[PDB]
Amino acid sequence: ANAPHGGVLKDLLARDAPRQAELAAEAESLPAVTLTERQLCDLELIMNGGFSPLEGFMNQADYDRVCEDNRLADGNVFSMPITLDASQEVIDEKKLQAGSRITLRDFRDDRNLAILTIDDIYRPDKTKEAKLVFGGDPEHPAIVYLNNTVKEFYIGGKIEAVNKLNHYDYVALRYTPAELRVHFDKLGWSRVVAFQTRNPMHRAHRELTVRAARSRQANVLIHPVVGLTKPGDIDHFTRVRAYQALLPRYPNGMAVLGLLGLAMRMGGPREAIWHAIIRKNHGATHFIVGRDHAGPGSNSKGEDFYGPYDAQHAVEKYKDELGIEVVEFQMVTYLPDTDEYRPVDQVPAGVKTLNISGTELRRRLRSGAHIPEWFSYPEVVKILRESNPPRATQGFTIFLTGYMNSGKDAIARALQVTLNQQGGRSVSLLLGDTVRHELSSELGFTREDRHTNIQRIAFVATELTRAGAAVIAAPIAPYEESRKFARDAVSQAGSFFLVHVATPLEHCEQSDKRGIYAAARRGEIKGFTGVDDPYETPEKADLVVDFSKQSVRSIVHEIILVLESQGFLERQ
Amino acid sequence: ANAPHGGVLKDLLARDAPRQAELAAEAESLPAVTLTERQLCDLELIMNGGFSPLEGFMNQADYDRVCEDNRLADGNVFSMPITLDASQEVIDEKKLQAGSRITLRDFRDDRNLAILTIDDIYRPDKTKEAKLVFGGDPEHPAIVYLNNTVKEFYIGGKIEAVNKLNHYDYVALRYTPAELRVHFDKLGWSRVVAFQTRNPMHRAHRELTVRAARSRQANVLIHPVVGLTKPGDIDHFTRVRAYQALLPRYPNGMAVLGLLGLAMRMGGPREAIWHAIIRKNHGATHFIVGRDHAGPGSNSKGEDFYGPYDAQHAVEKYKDELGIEVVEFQMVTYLPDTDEYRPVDQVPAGVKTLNISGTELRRRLRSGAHIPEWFSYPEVVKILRESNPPRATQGFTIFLTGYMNSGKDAIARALQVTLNQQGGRSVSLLLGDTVRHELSSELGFTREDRHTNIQRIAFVATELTRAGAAVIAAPIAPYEESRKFARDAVSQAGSFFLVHVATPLEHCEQSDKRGIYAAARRGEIKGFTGVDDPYETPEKADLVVDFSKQSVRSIVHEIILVLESQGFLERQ
Ligand SMILES: Nc1ncnc2c1ncn2[C@@H]1O[C@H](COP(=O)(O)OS(=O)(=O)O)[C@@H](O)[C@H]1O
Ligand SMILES: Nc1ncnc2c1ncn2[C@@H]1O[C@H](COP(=O)(O)OS(=O)(=O)O)[C@@H](O)[C@H]1O
Ligand SMILES: Nc1ncnc2c1ncn2[C@@H]1O[C@H](COP(=O)(O)OS(=O)(=O)O)[C@@H](O)[C@H]1O
Ligand SMILES: Nc1ncnc2c1ncn2[C@@H]1O[C@H](COP(=O)(O)OS(=O)(=O)O)[C@@H](O)[C@H]1O
């Protein structure tokens, strides 16, 4: 191990252990504030010493010296603002003011975690934070969070610990700075290189780590983030399973896997200084920083937020103040002819190098294509495939919208039979009327009530899509707002296709065998779509059909052809 | 977890941690006694609380109450004598007497471990121990140890801790009662069934453990012995590797593997009470006792030392005093027709049951034959095969003995060429003269010097055999004593074959082209085998040949045929 940053490990949970009962009791009495997931990651690392010397959510004095000088008021280096935000309504409703004692509660199990004592309650310049800490790009994940999720005020204050967060996943692999230190001891280690990561580890990474181990004569701590990462990365359960598949590739007893409940910001260079501090608090003697450490890639105009290696420079600016040795690496690649990996600054400008990008990997994962062993070990690839299956087995939703009696309900049942013939997956059919009877029996037909209904279809459709089913829904869905809502939700889990059954109102009305359009026409049914209520025509549907000009059979054939072109009907 | 036996966990290492430096210094000054491997297992468990309430090697008061009442003088149950034996010569040479302070040293790295303060120094009745503790059979492993390894006197006394033993194998899987308890906590466990074992775990055992887990609503602690076990079991590195291959067969986070540095005695029933105590000290809430727990099978006259289930009765006699719940099991077997396992007391006397015995398993391992998956998981079997390979790849030693110039040296070189033709393994040729030049250049030809020489051949032959080589040695080897020594050593690692080149002395002498027999005959070489020194004719060799009647070629053919009949020349 190594000494904590600042000299004292701020293990608030060990400090306040003797007062637990009392603190608990006192916590039942104060006004409680319930934490967001990101504040819960921060609170966990504060309470266990991970953010030493910090020992509570930053007050303005501390905050400002970081927002601009990468230091805490006490002078210690610290590059990342760690604050507890709240809205004016909560500040008032709870009567929060300096010197107040609030309880911080776990939204997951309602437990009282800590008691914070307010120093101040300031309103920060979200623009200067945006710009001074996370570069300035509005597309940057941290900045987007800063504006859309972070409330208006920051409540600074020291923390006293009531309970350690509960976690039900991987408890034996989670460690507090104190526990990890005791472990390095139990193992008899003295020099430990820590490896940060928010992705599955491939061949190249196994090499960085063994290289660092060999060069610094150190043991390896694979220390992945399991809290919050970049917006769309592979879930942590898949990643942990992947890190575990990799362990057997190191010589017996050389590496140890320990999980870090950090909530990354993707602050590139700053986040890198921050990471070094954290690993030092956890007891690592060395820490790897490679290409694009903690970087979130590039923005929409294709410009990338930080340059490669900038984070290595930043962590370098404080070589003398960060009490942990950084081990640098340049992009590592594969040399086919020699069958080896090395940093680019070691390949003779004439030698052949291979590399599979993020995009190429997703392409192969999606298509079922082979992924080279020089790239990633077999057991790892297997795990990745189990989580990101090919289109051949992914679920999807076919969303149908059109006037009542436009043929959308017959098209839906035929598509269902057709896909059951096709065979790949379980097919769930949600006909407008079925949804109305089974899920929305009590809603009405007001714009708000219809919107609610379509949201209900989307909630169900998303869970079925996530389980790999083929969901077929055919409600009227008059408003573009509900439809886009539907599409956004399902898209979180898989493909969503909007098929607009644009059969003309006259046709629909003239063939209604249930005299519903009739009753509407004689005012027995108020606000009926097409007669009273509107029908916002879909602007950019994936497919437009007409039961006036095409038959159920060929409309079905057209939908099938779309699923086919995108690989959903391939063989599993 | 659960409370220690006696109420206080005797963690001598945690107790004396604050005095470490002082104790260390004082330990450099007292007369030190170096521990045997079994005393080192006992010392480790004493110092870490595993044997709580015990806190040193038993003095007579404690000893006697166990030798006969299964209790320590303080009344607590304790069925196994734990003592530190010494010989009169050490007791005198060191001047040990009551009130003396000796240092206990680790023979492995010379470290000073503990300081013992002598209460007494008594001479125990090895016959009453033999009989009252380990039944009475002279073939029993404990008893054989008691008489052949245990010295004459037992030195009783409390212990103070200087250093915890060092171990270089599996440090992350080794646990002290304190560490395991902290771990059960970290994992959030409360009820824990511990499983004792000194063998690889097969399908049947995975079932006992899941059954106990399900019935007592408990988590599983696979707690194998890694100290000293029954005389010929599978080495602990192979077993640990096997337990690790098994873990993935339990549902995620249900079992934990922790190693126990116990030195078993194979005391059946008593050892079982003992084990319950130990597991309780380690914090387990329940402990499994099955068929023949801690039993060492049967003696030579085929009578088995303890009956099945006797140990379950014994641990039952103290149900009220052992503060840990025993979970009993009757022989568990495989029901082919249903493909399931259950205790025999659940198979309808008409149902079909399958079982592979220890012998059948060794038979298959030795022959390369398939081992059913209903019996043992695939990954486990693989590991067992890597450690106990078929005769096809085992090493072996061909030991040749006969008069100087009997043809033994030509037979040896031809056998070498022949086996190199054959191909399976690396062949090491140790011709008498080569051994004499390379290993024994300075020995003479006195009975003692020859014996030393043959021991040197055996040391080298054993290591090569262990590495799977074919060793061919052809020294004269005049004395049966040396030859039996040779055979015993190699037999520890693989097969040893004695080929007696019984070519008659006249023939040998008459064809000596080096005039050595000549110089012996004219007294220029004193004590020459056959002329002066004797040649103890081999009584039970594996093969007897004569260069007078057979040719090198067919003698070689006869040896090859023997290796073949035993499976060494099969294909790998
Ligand atoms: N091919 C590579 N060559 C060198 N360093 C790399 C390579 N891939 C990743 N790294 C570095 O290894 C760690 C792996 O990072 P990732 O999990 O991809 O994302 S990050 O946000 O944690 O940096 C970071 O230190 C990163 O800079
Ligand atoms: N005011 C109404 N407008 C349209 N359909 C109605 C109305 N009142 C009842 N219905 C009936 O309810 C179903 C329409 O339900 P949905 O498709 O669920 O409509 S949506 O607006 O929420 O998309 C059809 O059976 C239709 O005949
Ligand atoms: N087939 C079996 N059925 C029931 N109990 C068994 C079986 N095999 C072993 N056991 C029990 O499980 C543990 C395994 O013991 P072994 O490693 O074979 O040897 S022992 O010396 O530790 O008992 C002991 O409790 C033993 O009694
Ligand atoms: N006194 C002796 N008896 C037998 N062989 C001898 C003697 N002195 C020298 N030699 C030579 O040493 C070799 C005998 O050595 P070994 O086979 O090593 O004998 S053994 O007694 O130790 O088995 C042969 O070369 C032999 O000619």
Side-chain angles (χ1 to χ4, degrees), chain A residues 1-68 70-127 129-300 302 304-318 320-447 449-525 527-538 541-572, chain B residues 1-68 70-127 129-300 302 304-318 320-447 449-525 527-538 541-572:
Chain A
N2 177 194
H5 188 58
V8 182
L9 171 73
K10 265 42 195 306
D11 190 343
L12 307 202
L13 287 157
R15 187 188 68 199
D16 310 338
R19 286 195 288 161
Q20 208 290 313
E22 307 149 42
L23 285 155
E26 171 182 4
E28 303 286 340
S29 326
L30 332 161
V33 151
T34 280
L35 299 179
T36 65
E37 188 168 24
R38 181 216 249 179
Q39 300 161 337
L40 251 197
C41 285
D42 288 351
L43 177 72
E44 186 184 338
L45 286 169
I46 285 163
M47 302 177 15
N48 74 9
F51 286 172
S52 287
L54 194 55
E55 65 181 89
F57 281 107
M58 294 179 188
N59 52 46
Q60 201 186 310
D62 270 326
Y63 179 107
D64 288 339
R65 185 102 114 110
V66 180
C67 148
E68 65 223 37
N70 278 313
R71 277 160 200 296
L72 290 172
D74 68 15
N76 288 116
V77 195
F78 209 93
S79 33
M80 189 70 47
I82 304 295
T83 70
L84 166 63
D85 55 297
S87 68
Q88 184 77 63
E89 289 85 308
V90 194
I91 288 184
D92 300 333
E93 213 281 295
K94 301 283 194 38
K95 304 219 197 73
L96 312 188
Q97 66 172 83
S100 279
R101 304 194 111 217
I102 58 184
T103 282
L104 307 193
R105 183 166 301 149
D106 205 323
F107 78 78
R108 300 167 305 145
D109 48 15
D110 281 322
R111 302 202 320 157
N112 291 313
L113 300 179
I115 299 180
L116 179 147
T117 291
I118 315 197
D119 283 355
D120 43 13
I121 297 194
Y122 53 118
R123 174 154 190 288
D125 172 19
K126 290 196 179 168
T127 302
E129 203 181 305
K131 182 268 193 167
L132 283 169
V133 203
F134 315 114
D137 194 321
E139 221 145 45
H140 189 302
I143 290 176
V144 173
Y145 196 78
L146 187 41
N147 306 304
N148 298 52
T149 316
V150 179
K151 299 307 182 191
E152 175 189 18
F153 303 99
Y154 283 166
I155 292 180
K158 279 190 179 185
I159 298 290
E160 301 189 290
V162 189
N163 286 294
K164 57 173 307 183
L165 306 219
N166 263 163
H167 282 303
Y168 299 86
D169 57 336
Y170 311 112
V171 300
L173 295 185
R174 284 172 182 275
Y175 291 91
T176 53
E179 296 162 322
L180 203 53
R181 288 164 175 279
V182 168
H183 193 58
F184 289 160
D185 229 73
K186 189 200 187 168
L187 303 188
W189 288 7
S190 32
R191 330 175 80 284
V192 169
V193 216
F195 181 62
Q196 145 71 31
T197 185
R198 42 159 255 285
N199 281 315
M201 275 176 77
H202 301 301
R203 264 281 215 166
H205 314 89
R206 185 257 173 207
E207 298 306 322
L208 307 169
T209 63
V210 183
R211 281 171 153 259
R214 187 173 307 139
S215 97
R216 304 301 139 110
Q217 283 304 294
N219 276 282
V220 188
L221 169 76
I222 294 181
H223 206 216
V225 169
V226 124
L228 290 188
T229 276
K230 190 173 166 182
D233 341 42
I234 301 174
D235 70 283
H236 81 276
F237 305 85
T238 296
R239 295 194 278 108
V240 164
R241 220 176 269 142
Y243 307 131
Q244 288 173 309
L246 185 84
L247 293 178
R249 299 300 180 162
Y250 290 89
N252 260 282
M254 210 244 250
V256 156
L257 165 67
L259 317 186
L260 178 64
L262 184 68
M264 286 196 270
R265 262 77 173 167
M266 305 298 325
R270 308 201 94 174
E271 176 134 3
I273 292 160
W274 191 32
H275 285 174
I277 285 168
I278 301 169
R279 268 60 189 216
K280 184 185 160 44
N281 290 328
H282 283 80
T285 62
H286 302 69
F287 178 62
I288 287 160
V289 185
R291 164 190 259 272
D292 263 300
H293 189 113
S298 64
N299 68 54
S300 184
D304 48 48
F305 314 91
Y306 310 103
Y309 320 96
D310 284 358
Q312 307 189 311
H313 298 146
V315 78
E316 172 65 67
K317 181 74 63 70
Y318 309 78
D320 289 311
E321 290 174 271
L322 302 182
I324 174 161
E325 204 182 303
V326 170
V327 174
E328 304 182 306
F329 280 101
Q330 301 296 297
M331 165 104 305
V332 161
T333 4
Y334 184 57
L335 312 194
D337 299 325
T338 343
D339 179 45
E340 57 176 334
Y341 310 64
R342 54 175 65 159
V344 287
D345 60 280
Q346 282 166 52
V347 298
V351 202
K352 328 287 180 55
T353 56
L354 286 182
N355 164 66
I356 292 182
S357 62
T359 280
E360 183 53 12
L361 179 51
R362 286 175 227 105
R363 206 209 55 162
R364 313 213 179 170
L365 283 184
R366 168 157 39 232
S367 83
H370 193 72
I371 297 160
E373 305 211 0
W374 55 263
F375 175 72
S376 196
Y377 301 95
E379 28 300 295
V380 168
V381 166
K382 188 177 184 176
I383 276 130
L384 290 191
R385 283 178 196 301
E386 186 194 2
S387 302
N388 313 289
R391 286 297 185 59
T393 61
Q394 282 171 40
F396 59 82
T397 291
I398 296 289
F399 200 93
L400 296 156
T401 175
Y403 289 99
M404 194 277 223
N405 199 66
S406 53
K408 71 183 173 55
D409 304 89
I411 294 156
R413 288 172 181 294
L415 185 51
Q416 174 203 53
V417 168
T418 303
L419 291 171
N420 276 326
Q421 174 177 352
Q422 174 65 45
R425 36 204 134 198
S426 174
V427 183
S428 275
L429 177 71
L430 301 165
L431 287 173
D433 289 8
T434 295
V435 168
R436 280 274 170 178
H437 174 54
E438 301 286 355
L439 306 180
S440 316
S441 91
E442 295 319 315
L443 293 188
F445 296 80
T446 114
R447 219 256 188 192
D449 264 10
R450 297 188 171 200
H451 190 68
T452 274
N453 182 235
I454 302 296
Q455 290 177 324
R456 252 173 231 178
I457 284 164
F459 175 78
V460 173
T462 296
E463 297 307 303
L464 294 159
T465 296
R466 176 168 282 143
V471 184
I472 297 172
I476 294 187
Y479 307 92
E480 197 80 282
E481 213 217 309
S482 310
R483 305 194 290 254
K484 181 204 190 300
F485 174 97
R487 175 188 287 286
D488 296 339
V490 172
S491 295
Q492 289 304 290
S495 303
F496 177 98
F497 295 90
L498 186 77
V499 173
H500 179 204
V501 177
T503 294
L505 186 57
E506 309 74 292
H507 184 127
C508 306
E509 193 170 14
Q510 282 158 47
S511 49
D512 168 38
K513 306 196 217 318
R514 315 157 172 275
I516 289 160
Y517 274 95
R521 278 311 160 52
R522 62 178 171 277
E524 295 170 9
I525 291 168
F528 189 91
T529 309
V531 169
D532 299 279
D533 254 65
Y535 176 81
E536 288 171 34
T537 288
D542 296 276
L543 198 72
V544 189
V545 304
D546 186 8
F547 186 29
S548 291
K549 303 160 132 287
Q550 309 161 278
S551 63
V552 169
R553 207 164 255 107
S554 55
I555 277 166
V556 167
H557 174 71
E558 183 164 28
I559 295 180
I560 282 303
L561 277 153
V562 167
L563 289 166
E564 191 285 337
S565 69
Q566 292 181 42
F568 294 91
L569 304 182
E570 256 302 306
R571 276 6 224 119
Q572 18 196 63
Chain B
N2 177 194
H5 188 58
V8 182
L9 171 73
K10 265 42 195 306
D11 190 343
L12 307 202
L13 287 157
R15 187 188 68 199
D16 310 338
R19 286 195 288 161
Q20 208 290 313
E22 307 149 42
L23 285 155
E26 171 182 4
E28 303 286 340
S29 326
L30 332 161
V33 151
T34 280
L35 299 179
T36 65
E37 188 168 24
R38 181 216 249 179
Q39 300 161 337
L40 251 197
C41 285
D42 288 351
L43 177 72
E44 186 184 338
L45 286 169
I46 285 163
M47 302 177 15
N48 74 9
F51 286 172
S52 287
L54 194 55
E55 65 181 89
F57 281 107
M58 294 179 188
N59 52 46
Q60 201 186 310
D62 270 326
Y63 179 107
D64 288 339
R65 185 102 114 110
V66 180
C67 148
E68 65 223 37
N70 278 313
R71 277 160 200 296
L72 290 172
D74 68 15
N76 288 116
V77 195
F78 209 93
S79 33
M80 189 70 47
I82 304 295
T83 70
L84 166 63
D85 55 297
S87 68
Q88 184 77 63
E89 289 85 308
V90 194
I91 288 184
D92 300 333
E93 213 281 295
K94 301 283 194 38
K95 304 219 197 73
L96 312 188
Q97 66 172 83
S100 279
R101 304 194 111 217
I102 58 184
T103 282
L104 307 193
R105 183 166 301 149
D106 205 323
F107 78 78
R108 300 167 305 145
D109 48 15
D110 281 322
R111 302 202 320 157
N112 291 313
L113 300 179
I115 299 180
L116 179 147
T117 291
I118 315 197
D119 283 355
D120 43 13
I121 297 194
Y122 53 118
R123 174 154 190 288
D125 172 19
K126 290 196 179 168
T127 302
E129 203 181 305
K131 182 268 193 167
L132 283 169
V133 203
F134 315 114
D137 194 321
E139 221 145 45
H140 189 302
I143 290 176
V144 173
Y145 196 78
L146 187 41
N147 306 304
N148 298 52
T149 316
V150 179
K151 299 307 182 191
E152 175 189 18
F153 303 99
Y154 283 166
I155 292 180
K158 279 190 179 185
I159 298 290
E160 301 189 290
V162 189
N163 286 294
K164 57 173 307 183
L165 306 219
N166 263 163
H167 282 303
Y168 299 86
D169 57 336
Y170 311 112
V171 300
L173 295 185
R174 284 172 182 275
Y175 291 91
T176 53
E179 296 162 322
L180 203 53
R181 288 164 175 279
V182 168
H183 193 58
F184 289 160
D185 229 73
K186 189 200 187 168
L187 303 188
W189 288 7
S190 32
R191 330 175 80 284
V192 169
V193 216
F195 181 62
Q196 145 71 31
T197 185
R198 42 159 255 285
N199 281 315
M201 275 176 77
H202 301 301
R203 264 281 215 166
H205 314 89
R206 185 257 173 207
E207 298 306 322
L208 307 169
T209 63
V210 183
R211 281 171 153 259
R214 187 173 307 139
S215 97
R216 304 301 139 110
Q217 283 304 294
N219 276 282
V220 188
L221 169 76
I222 294 181
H223 206 216
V225 169
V226 124
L228 290 188
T229 276
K230 190 173 166 182
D233 341 42
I234 301 174
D235 70 283
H236 81 276
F237 305 85
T238 296
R239 295 194 278 108
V240 164
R241 220 176 269 142
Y243 307 131
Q244 288 173 309
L246 185 84
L247 293 178
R249 299 300 180 162
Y250 290 89
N252 260 282
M254 210 244 250
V256 156
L257 165 67
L259 317 186
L260 178 64
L262 184 68
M264 286 196 270
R265 262 77 173 167
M266 305 298 325
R270 308 201 94 174
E271 176 134 3
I273 292 160
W274 191 32
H275 285 174
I277 285 168
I278 301 169
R279 268 60 189 216
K280 184 185 160 44
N281 290 328
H282 283 80
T285 62
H286 302 69
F287 178 62
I288 287 160
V289 185
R291 164 190 259 272
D292 263 300
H293 189 113
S298 64
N299 68 54
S300 184
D304 48 48
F305 314 91
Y306 310 103
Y309 320 96
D310 284 358
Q312 307 189 311
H313 298 146
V315 78
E316 172 65 67
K317 181 74 63 70
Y318 309 78
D320 289 311
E321 290 174 271
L322 302 182
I324 174 161
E325 204 182 303
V326 170
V327 174
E328 304 182 306
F329 280 101
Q330 301 296 297
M331 165 104 305
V332 161
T333 4
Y334 184 57
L335 312 194
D337 299 325
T338 343
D339 179 45
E340 57 176 334
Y341 310 64
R342 54 175 65 159
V344 287
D345 60 280
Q346 282 166 52
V347 298
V351 202
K352 328 287 180 55
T353 56
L354 286 182
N355 164 66
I356 292 182
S357 62
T359 280
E360 183 53 12
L361 179 51
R362 286 175 227 105
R363 206 209 55 162
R364 313 213 179 170
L365 283 184
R366 168 157 39 232
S367 83
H370 193 72
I371 297 160
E373 305 211 0
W374 55 263
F375 175 72
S376 196
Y377 301 95
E379 28 300 295
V380 168
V381 166
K382 188 177 184 176
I383 276 130
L384 290 191
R385 283 178 196 301
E386 186 194 2
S387 302
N388 313 289
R391 286 297 185 59
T393 61
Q394 282 171 40
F396 59 82
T397 291
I398 296 289
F399 200 93
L400 296 156
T401 175
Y403 289 99
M404 194 277 223
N405 199 66
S406 53
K408 71 183 173 55
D409 304 89
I411 294 156
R413 288 172 181 294
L415 185 51
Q416 174 203 53
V417 168
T418 303
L419 291 171
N420 276 326
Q421 174 177 352
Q422 174 65 45
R425 36 204 134 198
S426 174
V427 183
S428 275
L429 177 71
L430 301 165
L431 287 173
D433 289 8
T434 295
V435 168
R436 280 274 170 178
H437 174 54
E438 301 286 355
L439 306 180
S440 316
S441 91
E442 295 319 315
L443 293 188
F445 296 80
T446 114
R447 219 256 188 192
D449 264 10
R450 297 188 171 200
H451 190 68
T452 274
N453 182 235
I454 302 296
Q455 290 177 324
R456 252 173 231 178
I457 284 164
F459 175 78
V460 173
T462 296
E463 297 307 303
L464 294 159
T465 296
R466 176 168 282 143
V471 184
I472 297 172
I476 294 187
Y479 307 92
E480 197 80 282
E481 213 217 309
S482 310
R483 305 194 290 254
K484 181 204 190 300
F485 174 97
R487 175 188 287 286
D488 296 339
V490 172
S491 295
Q492 289 304 290
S495 303
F496 177 98
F497 295 90
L498 186 77
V499 173
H500 179 204
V501 177
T503 294
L505 186 57
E506 309 74 292
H507 184 127
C508 306
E509 193 170 14
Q510 282 158 47
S511 49
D512 168 38
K513 306 196 217 318
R514 315 157 172 275
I516 289 160
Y517 274 95
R521 278 311 160 52
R522 62 178 171 277
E524 295 170 9
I525 291 168
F528 189 91
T529 309
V531 169
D532 299 279
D533 254 65
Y535 176 81
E536 288 171 34
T537 288
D542 296 276
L543 198 72
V544 189
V545 304
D546 186 8
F547 186 29
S548 291
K549 303 160 132 287
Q550 309 161 278
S551 63
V552 169
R553 207 164 255 107
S554 55
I555 277 166
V556 167
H557 174 71
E558 183 164 28
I559 295 180
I560 282 303
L561 277 153
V562 167
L563 289 166
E564 191 285 337
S565 69
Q566 292 181 42
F568 294 91
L569 304 182
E570 256 302 306
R571 276 6 224 119
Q572 18 196 63

